[PDB]
Design a protein around this ligand. Structure first.
Ligand code: AGS
Ligand code: MG
Lengths: 169, 319, 258, 258, 254
C-alpha cells in the first residue's frame, strides 16, 4: 500500500535526509546499535538533519533492535527529566519512523507506549507512476497505468521496470 | 570421409535483425533499440527453436559493432553460473572500464537463465542495479516463472510466440532459393506440419530430407520423419468406436516400436490439452490414463493395460 | 600514480595475511608519505588499518595520490608468487581500473606480473583511534596468540580484565572455565619478552573469540603486540612494522557483540 | 581425594590419546597405589585399561580413593593446553561433580585451570587378563604400526598366525592379499629393535582392522609393544610406561566379530 | 615372465606418483630391453608414457614379454609400503591374473608381499611422438612447477608462447591476468639451473591448467623438464630417469 514510500516522501518534504534500516535483515541489534547511535547522535556530512526509517520491525525475531530503541527512549526520558527538575546525556534530536505489517506482534509491546500509532488503509501507486511518466515526457493514458498496476499486483519495482520497457519501445 | 559441412541451422543462422521472421513487434522493437541505443535489461522467454538466442545475439552484435569481443560477456548453461561466478566474474566485467560510444553499453548475455540457482539470481540483483549505467543484462529462457520476481522487476519482458505457417514457409522458401533444392507444395506442407512452429526443427528436417533423398516431397518427409506423435494419439483417443481406437493403437503406435511409457505420457499431454470434450469427461479420462500410468511405472507396462485404459475412457464417454 | 617497491615480497604477503579471512574488501590509498589501507568486516565489529611509511620501501614515488579498492581474496590468491625473496612492485595510474603487482628475481630471468581488477568503494576512511585508553599493555605476540588459542576452545567470548599490575584473560563455557593470568615484568636478558602495563583505570571487556583469533595473525609481523583498551571505544591491538604498523580495532561485546 | 601432579603434561596427553576415538566414556579411579582407568567401546570388543603407579608422578597424595567417570571427547578437547612441558595436576574432592585439570608453567606466569563435568558410570571394572596366553611376542611398536597400516588397506580383517619361530600377519580382500612375516631375533647393537616370541601353542586369530588401527596409537608411549594371544580370550596389546602400562584387550573375530 | 627388482622402492613410488590422479588405468609391458607403461585419461587429452631400461634395475630378467593392465588407484594404495629404502621386486608369470609386489628389508626380517588383481585392457600402445617439434626448451622442474602453480590460480587455461629467445607463460581470467617471462641462459656456477631454448618456429599454444598441474609432479623424478611444442601435435613434457624417462603428452586447446 506504500507505507515505506509515504514515510520517505513525507520525511524528504519536511527537509530531513532519510536513512532506511531493514529491521528483519539486521541480525545484530547489539552491533547495529553502533549504526543507530551514529545515525541519531552524530552530525551527517549532509546539510539536512537525518530521519531514521526502520522497516519490517515486526520481523525482528531477536528483540535486539527494539531493546536498543527502548533503551534510547528511556535514556532520553531520564535526560529530559534532568533538564526540567535537575538543580545545577544525549537527547534525541532526530525523528524515528517505524513501519510494521502487524501491530500486535509480541516484540512491539514494549515500544507501543513510546509510539504515535498511524494506520495506513488500502491510488498512491498510480499518482507516483503518473509523476514518473510526466518527468520522462511519456504521454501514457491512465487506463494503461491501471492495467500495469493490476499486472504488477502492487509491486512498485515491477511497475517501474514495465514502464521503462514501454518507454524504450 | 574427412570433414563435414555446416548444418543449415548454423550456416543460415540470422546475423541481422531483419532476417528474423519471428514475432514482428518485438523484432522491430529490438531493431529500433539497436538503432537508437540505450538497451535496457531484458528477459526473452518462449519455446525452443523460435529465435530467442539468435535475436539477442543479433541485437548485441548490431549494438556493439566491432566492440562485441570486449563488450559482450556470454554465459551459457554449459558454464558454471553459480554464486561464486556471479560474485567474481560478472562483477569484474560490470566494473571493467571500457570506452564505448555515447549510445552503447556493455551487454551480459545469459543463455538458459531458467537454470541459474536461487543464490546467483539473488546476487545478480544489486550487481545489475549498481552498474546499470555501463552494463546491461539480457536473459534468454524458456520459462519466465523460473526467474525470481525481483529480477523480472528490473527488466523488460519479451514473450516470444509460436511461428505461424506463413513465416516458416517464407523462411523455407528463402532457404530453398539460396540452396537450389527441388521441392513441391505438399512436401513443404508436410515439413511445416511436422515442425509445429519449430523453425530450427523445420530447417533440420528440411536439410535431412534433402541430404537423404534430394527431392522434398511429402512421401519422403513422411518416410524419413514421424507424423507428429501427438496427432495419432489424439486421433486414437478421439475415436468413436472401440475397435477403431484399438486398431490405431496396434498399427500406428505398437507395431512401429513406440514404447508404452511414451504412449501413455503423450496420451496424458493430449488429454490435458484437449478442447473438443467437456471438463469432467477430460478429468475422468486423465484419471484413467493416470491410474494405468501407476501400473505402467511399476513394470506392468503392456498392450493390455493401454487397451483397458482405452476401454475405460470409452466407458466414461459411454454416458 | 602508485609506484611502491618492496625489497622482499614477503613483507607485503604477511601484511595481507593479516587482513585475510576477517575482511573481504580493502581500500588502499597511496600518497606522499606512504600507503594506508582500511578494511571493515560485514558486521562492522572489526577494522583493520595499515600504515607503511616511505622508508619501508626500496623505492617509492608518488606525485599524485591514488585510492583503490579490491577484493582481499583475489589479492591473496595472487600473493603467493613472491618467493618471499622476490622483489615486489605495486603499480597503478591515477585513474586505475586495475592494480599491477610485479614480482622479479634479482637477475632478469623470471618476471611474474599480475593485473588485478579493482572494485569501486566509497572512500570513507575511519579515524576512531583515541587519545588516551583506560589501559595499555604490550607483550610478546606469540604469547598473546597462545593465550588466545588456549581460551578459544572454551568459549566464543574471552574476557580481558585489568587491575593494578594484573592482566587476566578468561573464558567460560560448556566444558568449564579457564583463565590466564600474567604480570608485568622487565627481562633484561632480552626485553622483547617483557610484559609492560600502564593502567589509568581498571578495565574489564569481553571480545568474541573468533575475532581475537583473526587478530593474532599479526604475530608474523612483529615480536610484540600492543593492546589498548577503553570502556569508551573499540580496543586497539597493534603490530609495529619498520616504518608503519598494522592495527586491529575490535568493538567489545555489549553482552553479545563480538 | 585426587591429587596427582604430572611432571610433563605431555605424558597424560599421550595416554588419553590412546583412549581417544575408540571409546567415549572412561572410568578413572585414584587410590593409594596409583591411578587406574578403564573404558569399553559400545560394541564391547575393546577394553582400554590404564595403570599409573605413584612413582610416575612428581607429587601424588591419596588418603581416600575417588572414582570418576567422564566423556573422553570432553577430556581430549581440554587436553591440548599442556604445552607438553607444562606441569599438570589432576584434582578432585571425595564426592566430586567435576575434575580439575591445572596446567602451570614453571614461573607463576600463566595458569590454565579447567573444571570438567563428570558423568555417573556404574563402577564395574573388568579383570579379564589371563594367567597364561598361548603365545607372547614383543617387537618395536613403530614396526607393529607399519604392519597394521600396510594390511589395513586390503581388508577389514587382519589375521595373526603364530607357529614356532614365526609370526605372520595376513589380510585378504577385494584388491588381493598381503602378508607380513617376521622372525624372532636379538639385536645387540640395540635390543629395543629385537623381536621376541614365546610360543606354548600355535595360535591363529583374526581381528577387525579398524580396532588394530585404534590400538597402534600406543606407539607414542613406548618403544615396544607386547602382544599376548589366546584362543580362550581377548588378545592383549600392551604399552609399558615408567611405572605403569596402557593395555588394549581385543576380542578376536568369531568369523565376524572385531 | 616379469622379474624386476628396484634397488629402492622409492623410484617406483615416485614414477607411479606421476600417473596418479590424472589417469585410472595403466598398461604395463615388460620385455627384453625393459619396461614400458602407457595410460590415457578419459577425455583423451593426456597420455602418460614410461620407459625404464634394464640398467635402472638391480636385477631384471625377461625371457618372455608380459603385458598387464591395472587400476592406478589400487597400485598407489599399495605403493606406500616401500619404506623408500626397501627393495622392490615386481613379479608375474607369462599369463598373469595378478601382479606381485615384493618389498623386503636388507635383513631377512620383514617381507611385505602384495598380489594385485589385474584388469584386461586391449593392448594398443600409441606412438604419437614427433620427429621435430616447433620449439624445444628445458628448465629446472621446480621452476616449471612454480610457473604452473602461479598462473593456475588465475584461469583454467595457461598459454605458452615462444619467440626468439623468449618463453612466456600467460593466464587471464576473472580476477585479472598474469604472466611469467623467462629467458634462455647458461649458468656455469651449476648448469642444472640453466634455461635452454631451441626455436625453429615461434609457437603459441594453450593448455588446460588442471592438466599442467597433473604434469608438474614429474619434478620429483628429475631436476629438469623438457618441453617440446608443436602446432601439429600434443605437447611433450619429459622427465628423464637414469635409463628411462616419464613423458606426458598433452593436447593443446582448440
Ligand atoms: N525467426 C527465425 N528466423 C530464421 N531462422 C530462425 C528463426 N528462429 C529460429 N531460427 C533458426 O533456428 C536456429 C536456432 O534458433 P534459436 O534462437 O537458437 O532457438 P531458440 O528460440 O533460442 O530456442 P532455444 O535456444 O531452444 S531456448 C537458428 O540458428 C536459425 O537457423
Ligand atoms: Mg538458445
Amino acid at each position: 500500500i506504500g507505507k515505506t514510500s509515504v514515510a520517505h516522501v513525507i520525511a524528504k518534504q519536511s527537509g530531513f535526509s532519510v536513512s532506511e534500516i531493514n529491521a528483519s535483515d539486521e541480525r545484530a541489534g547489539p552491533m547495529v546499535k553502533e549504526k543507530i547511535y551514529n545515525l541519531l547522535f552524530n552530525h551527517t556530512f549532509d546539510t539536512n538533519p537525518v530521519c531514521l526509517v526502520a522497516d519490517e520491525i515486526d520481523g525482528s525475531i531477536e528483540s535486539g533492535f527494539i531493546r536498543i530503541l527502548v533503551d534510547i527512549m528511556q535514556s532520553d526520558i531520564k535526560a529530559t527529566n534532568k533538564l526540567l527538575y535537575g538543580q545545577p546525556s544525549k537527547l534525541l534530536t532526530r525523528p524515528i519512523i517505524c513501519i510494521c505489517n502487524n501491530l500486535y506482534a509480541p516484540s512491539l509491546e514494549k515500544l507501543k507506549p513510546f509510539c504515535e500509532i498511524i494506520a495506513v488503509k488500502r491510488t498512491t501507486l498510480l499518482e507516483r507512476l503518473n509523476l514518473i511518466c510526466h518527468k520522462e515526457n511519456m504521454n501514457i493514458p491512465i487506463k494503461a497505468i491501471n492495467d500495469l498496476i493490476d499486472l504488477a499486483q502492487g509491486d512498485v519495482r515491477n511497475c517501474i521496470n514495465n514502464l521503462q520497457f514501454l518507454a524504450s519501445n | 570421409t574427412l570433414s563435414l559441412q555446416l548444418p543449415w541451422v548454423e550456416k543460415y543462422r540470422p546475423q541481422v535483425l531483419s532476417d528474423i521472421v519471428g514475432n514482428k513487434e518485438t523484432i522491430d522493437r529490438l531493431q529500433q533499440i539497436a538503432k537508437d541505443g540505450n538497451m535496457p535489461h531484458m528477459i526473452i522467454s518462449g519455446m525452443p527453436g523460435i529465435g530467442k538466442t539468435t535475436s539477442v545475439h543479433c541485437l548485441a552484435h548490431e549494438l556493439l559493432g566491432r566492440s562485441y569481443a570486449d563488450g559482450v560477456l556470454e554465459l551459457n548453461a554449459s558454464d558454471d553460473r553459480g554464486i561464486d561466478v556471479v560474485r567474481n566474474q560478472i562483477k569484474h566485467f560490470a566494473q571493467k572500464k571500457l570506452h564505448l560510444p555515447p549510445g552503447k553499453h556493455k551487454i551480459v548475455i545469459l543463455d538458459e537463465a531458467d537454470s541459474m540457482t536461487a543464490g546467483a539470481q539473488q546476487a545478480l540483483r544489486r550487481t545489475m542495479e549498481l552498474y546499470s549505467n555501463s552494463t546491461r543484462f539480457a536473459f534468454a529462457c524458456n520459462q519466465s516463472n523460473k526467474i525470481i520476481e525481483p529480477l523480472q522487476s528490473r527488466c523488460a519482458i519479451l514473450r516470444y510466440s509460436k511461428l505461424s505457417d506463413e513465416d516458416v514457409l517464407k523462411r523455407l522458401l528463402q532457404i530453398i532459393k539460396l540452396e537450389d533444392v527441388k521441392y513441391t507444395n505438399d512436401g513443404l506442407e508436410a515439413i511445416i506440419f511436422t515442425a509445429e512452429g519449430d523453425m530450427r526443427q523445420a530447417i533440420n528436417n528440411l536439410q535431412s530430407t534433402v541430404a537423404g533423398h534430394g527431392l522434398v516431397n511429402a512421401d519422403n518427409v513422411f518416410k524419413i520423419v514421424d507424423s507428429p506423435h501427438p496427432l495419432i494419439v489424439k486421433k486414437m483417443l478421439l475415436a468413436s468406436n472401440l475397435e477403431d481406437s484399438i486398431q490405431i493403437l496396434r498399427t500406428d503406435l505398437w507395431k512401429k516400436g513406440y514404447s508404452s511409457i511414451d504412449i501413455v505420457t503423450t496420451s496424458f499431454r493430449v488429454t490435458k490439452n484437449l478442447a473438443q470434450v467437456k471438463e469432467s469427461v477430460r478429468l475422468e479420462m486423465i484419471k484413467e490414463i493416470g491410474l494405468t500410468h501407476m501400473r505402467i511405472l511399476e513394470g506392468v507396462g503392456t498392450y493390455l493395460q493401454l487397451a483397458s485404459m482405452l476401454a475405460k475412457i470409452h466407458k466414461l464417454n459411454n454416458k | 600514480m602508485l609506484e611502491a617497491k618492496f625489497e622482499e615480497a614477503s613483507l607485503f604477503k604477511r601484511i595481507i595475511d593479516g587482513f585475510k579471512d576477517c575482511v573481504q574488501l580493502v581500500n588502499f590509498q597511496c600518497k606522499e608519505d606512504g600507503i594506508i589501507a582500511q578494511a571493515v568486516d560485514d558486521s562492522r565489529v572489526l577494522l583493520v588499518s595499515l600504515e607503511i611509511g616511505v622508508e619501508a620501501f626500496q623505492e617509492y614515488r608518488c606525485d599524485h595520490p591514488v585510492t583503490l579498492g579490491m577484493d582481499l581474496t583475489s589479492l591473496s590468491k595472487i600473493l603467493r608468487c613472491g618467493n618471499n625473496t622476490d622483489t615486489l612492485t605495486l603499480i597503478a595510474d591515477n585513474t586505475p581500473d586495475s592494480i599491477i603487482l610485479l614480482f622479479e628475481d634479482t637477475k632478469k630471468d623470471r618476471i611474474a606480473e599480475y593485473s588485478l581488477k579493482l572494485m569501486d568503494i566509497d572512500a570513507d576512511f575511519l579515524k576512531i583511534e583515541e587519545l588516551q585508553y583506560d589501559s595499555t599493555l604490550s607483550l610478546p605476540s606469540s604469547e598473546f596468540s597462545k593465550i588466545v588459542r588456549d581460551l578459544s576452545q572454551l568459549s566464543d567470548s574471552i574476557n580481558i580484565m585489568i587491575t593494578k599490575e594484573t592482566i587476566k584473560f578468561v573464558a567460560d563455557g560448556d566444558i568449564g572455565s579457564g583463565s590466564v593470568i600474567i604480570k608485568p615484568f622487565v627481562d633484561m636478558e632480552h626485553p622483547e619478552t617483557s610484559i609492560k602495563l600502564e593502567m589509568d583505570q581498571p578495565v574489564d571487556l569481553t571480545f568474541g573469540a573468533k575475532y581475537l583469533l583473526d587478530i593474532i595473525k599479526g604475530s608474523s609481523l612483529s615480536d610484540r603486540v600492543g593492546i589498548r583498551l577503553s570502556s569508551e571505544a573499540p580496543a586497539l591491538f597493534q603490530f609495529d612494522l619498520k616504518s608503519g604498523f598494522l592495527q586491529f580495532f575490535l568493538a567489545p561485546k555489549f553482552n553479545d557483540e563480538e
